[PDB]
Structures are given as C-alpha cells and as structure tokens.
Design an enzyme around this catalytic site. Structure first.
Site, mmCIF file in Angstrom:
data_model
loop_
_atom_site.group_PDB
_atom_site.id
_atom_site.type_symbol
_atom_site.label_atom_id
_atom_site.label_comp_id
_atom_site.label_asym_id
_atom_site.label_seq_id
_atom_site.Cartn_x
_atom_site.Cartn_y
_atom_site.Cartn_z
ATOM 1 N N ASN A 20 0.812 -1.084 -0.079
ATOM 2 C CA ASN A 20 0.054 -0.189 0.287
ATOM 3 C C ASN A 20 0.796 1.131 -0.513
ATOM 4 O OD1 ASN A 20 -2.650 1.045 0.278
ATOM 5 N ND2 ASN A 20 -2.540 1.215 2.191
ATOM 6 N N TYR A 23 6.653 0.755 1.166
ATOM 7 C CA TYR A 23 8.409 0.240 0.940
ATOM 8 C C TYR A 23 8.231 1.312 -0.123
ATOM 9 C CZ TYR A 23 6.934 -4.381 2.302
ATOM 10 O OH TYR A 23 5.995 -5.645 3.060
ATOM 11 N N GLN A 25 7.880 3.453 -3.139
ATOM 12 C CA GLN A 25 7.782 3.148 -4.763
ATOM 13 C C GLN A 25 7.962 1.558 -4.928
ATOM 14 O OE1 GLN A 25 5.214 5.313 -5.561
ATOM 15 N NE2 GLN A 25 6.042 5.133 -7.957
ATOM 16 N N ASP A 140 16.298 -1.647 9.763
ATOM 17 C CA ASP A 140 15.674 -1.539 9.356
ATOM 18 C C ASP A 140 14.495 -2.332 9.451
ATOM 19 O OD1 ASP A 140 12.666 0.796 7.618
ATOM 20 O OD2 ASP A 140 12.729 -0.135 9.871
HETATM 21 N N1 LIG Z 1 0.500 -8.643 -1.021
HETATM 22 C C1 LIG Z 1 1.482 -8.483 -0.574
HETATM 23 O O1 LIG Z 1 1.060 -8.298 1.099
HETATM 24 C C2 LIG Z 1 3.014 -8.887 -0.283
HETATM 25 C C3 LIG Z 1 3.523 -7.408 0.073
HETATM 26 C C4 LIG Z 1 4.995 -7.303 -0.041
HETATM 27 C C5 LIG Z 1 5.435 -8.629 -0.818
HETATM 28 C C6 LIG Z 1 7.011 -8.179 -1.817
HETATM 29 N N2 LIG Z 1 7.593 -8.838 -2.231
HETATM 30 C C7 LIG Z 1 8.706 -8.750 -2.336
HETATM 31 C C8 LIG Z 1 8.919 -7.368 -1.242
HETATM 32 C C9 LIG Z 1 10.463 -6.151 -1.417
HETATM 33 C C10 LIG Z 1 9.765 -4.689 -0.631
HETATM 34 C C11 LIG Z 1 10.728 -4.342 -0.436
HETATM 35 C C12 LIG Z 1 11.711 -4.236 -1.595
HETATM 36 CL CL1 LIG Z 1 12.729 -2.892 -0.870
HETATM 37 C C13 LIG Z 1 12.200 -5.357 -2.214
HETATM 38 C C14 LIG Z 1 11.376 -6.434 -1.673
HETATM 39 O O2 LIG Z 1 7.503 -6.957 -1.268
HETATM 40 C C15 LIG Z 1 4.937 -9.558 -1.689
HETATM 41 C C16 LIG Z 1 3.541 -9.574 -1.081
#
Ligand SMILES: NC(=O)c1ccc(-c2ncc(-c3ccc(Cl)cc3)o2)cc1
Length: 284
Positions: A20, A23, A25, A140
């Site tokens: 949302n 993270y 962008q 973090d």
């Molecule tokens: N649908 C979800 O809740 C969801 C939420 C997150 C993810 C996810 N996979 C990899 C990453 C990631 C985040 C920050 C960085 Cl810096 C790198 C990779 O985030 C997949 C699904």
C-alpha cells in the site's frame, strides 16, 4: 556500468504498487515471457546519483543469495527524453504470502502461537547472521520488512534518504540524546529490532503503538526495556525478549549468541509449524 542495463519494455511489466506504500515505489511485477512474479523497486536517477546507485546493485548481488534474504534478479533503466529524468528498476523476489505484520493482523486475536514466533525469529536471526558476518547492518528490522513466500520461507527485505521513518522498532543507541550525541547503528541494533518484532508477533503491535511517533522516539532511550503484556508465555520466550531488549547495546548478545538461546535453539515442532504456516497461506 549503468549504460549496459537494458530497457525493461517487453521483459518486465508493472502490475500495481505492492502492499500500500510501506515500501514506497515498490511494485508487483511480471516477467513477460514466463508470467513469473517479481517485486520491482522503482526510483528516479539523476547524473550525480549514478555512483551511489552502483553500490546498491553490488550489495544485492552479493548478499541477497542467502535463503533468508529476498533474491535480487537484475536491474533495468527506463531512459526518459533529454529533458529528464531516467527510472531505475531493481527486480527482486516476490514474496506472495506478504509480511509478518499482515500475518498477525489476519490471525484471530492478533497474536501468533509461541512455536510460530520461535521459527520466524530464528529465520530473522539467520538472515541477520548472514548480513552481520559480511559487516552489513540491516537498519530496518520490523514486521513489514520480514516476508513470507508461498512455501512459508521467511525472507528479509530493504537493508542498507531525507525522511525519518517509523520509530517503534528503533534501538535506544540509534536515537541521539545529550548522553549519546553521535547516535550510530551497531550490528546489535538489529537484535533490539528483532525483539520488538517478536513482541509485535505476540501482541499484534510494537510496544509504544498508542503514542504519537515523536513521543515514542523520545521515550525509547529513556524508558526501561519493553516487556510482554501477558503472563501466558513460556520462561524461554520472556528470556529471549530479555536477551534482544538489553537497553545498553554493549551488554546485548550477538546474533550468534541469540541463535544458541533455548527459545531459538530448541524447536521440536519445527516441521509442524512450517505445515501450519503453509496452511494459513493456502487460505488467501
Ligand atoms: N500482497 C502483499 O501483501 C505483498 C507484500 C509485499 C510483497 C513483497 N515481495 C517482495 C517485496 C519487497 C519489498 C521491499 C523491497 Cl525494498 C524489496 C522487495 O515485497 C509481496 C506481496
């Protein structure tokens, strides 16, 4: 060498922003040729930012190949017209089951079973040990930065700039005060954050969640170490929380020491917990 980085045109597609905006962008991406998913970190890159950006790629190439770190795939540059500004795409492993924060929020009573906490915390510690051995501080650690794959594998994301983020998982030593004027991150700062994440798994929220973020930042270096609210927990879990949350980082145990702690070391239900987590994931 950023000039060698290909345009992503018919290689990777942007689907939607992932999460949302926790993270920023970071997008849900698709490999055009296979349909395989990826997490795409997007950033505008200027001519002066080029040198700082090269070190980020190199860090991901060396450290993301551990099983408790989301894998780095590659980098792309989407070149904009001479009137600026070019976009850099860092393509990483997509962890479909989402964050540990989502896992606690989707669980009845917003609390996880003690054996789930031990398994997840050990996987966090194993990822931190890989980073610490290579002289890398994550900086973090929080529930949102710990993700689950579809196969209940635990992976760390976003390791190491004009904004200060959330204070709730910050170790006392990283918050500057009159006694500690030159606040600096130590490898042990990640251990405090792991302890706060373990409280977050146990209660659904970190310790000073009800405070304005500025008030929490003031309170962390002044308040005694946070404690678990309920008395239901085992003596080993209270001891693990106590180990992580040593106020003065100089007496705080290392990642290697915490990995040998009975709560982390003694896990006979490890196989069942993995199946239990996988089952919760299957219920989308
Ligand atoms: N649908 C979800 O809740 C969801 C939420 C997150 C993810 C996810 N996979 C990899 C990453 C990631 C985040 C920050 C960085 Cl810096 C790198 C990779 O985030 C997949 C699904």
């Amino acid at each position: 060498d950023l000039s060698s980085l290909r345009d992503p045109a018919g290689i990777f597609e942007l689907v939607e922003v992932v999460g949302n905006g926790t993270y920023g962008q970071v997008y849900k991406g698709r490999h055009v040729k296979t349909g395989q998913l990826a997490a795409i970190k997007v950033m505008d890159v200027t001519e002066d930012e080029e040198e700082e950006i090269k070190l980020e790629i190199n860090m991901l190439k060396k450290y993301s190949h551990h099983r408790n770190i989301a894998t780095y795939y590659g980098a792309f540059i989407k070149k904009s017209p001479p009137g600026h500004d070019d976009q850099l795409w860092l393509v990483m492993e997509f962890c479909g089951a989402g964050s540990i924060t989502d896992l606690v929020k989707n669980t009845k009573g917003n609390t996880l079973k003690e054996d789930w906490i031990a398994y997840i915390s050990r996987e966090i510690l194993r990822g931190l040990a890989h980073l610490h051995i290579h002289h890398v501080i994550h900086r973090d650690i929080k529930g949102q930065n710990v993700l689950l794959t579809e196969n209940a594998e635990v992976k760390l994301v976003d390791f190491g700039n004009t904004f200060i983020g959330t204070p709730y998982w910050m170790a006392p030593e990283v918050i500057a005060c009159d006694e500690n004027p030159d606040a600096t991150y130590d490898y042990r700062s990640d251990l405090w954050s792991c302890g706060i994440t373990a409280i977050e798994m146990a209660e659904g929220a970190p310790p000073l969640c009800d405070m304005h973020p500025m008030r929490a930042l003031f309170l962390i270096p002044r308040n005694p170490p946070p404690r678990l609210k309920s008395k239901k927990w085992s003596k080993k879990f209270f001891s693990f929380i106590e180990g992580c949350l040593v106020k003065n980082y100089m007496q705080r145990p290392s990642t290697e020491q915490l990995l040998k702690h009975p709560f982390i070391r003694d896990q006979p239900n490890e196989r069942q917990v993995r199946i239990q987590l996988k089952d919760h994931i299957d219920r989308t």
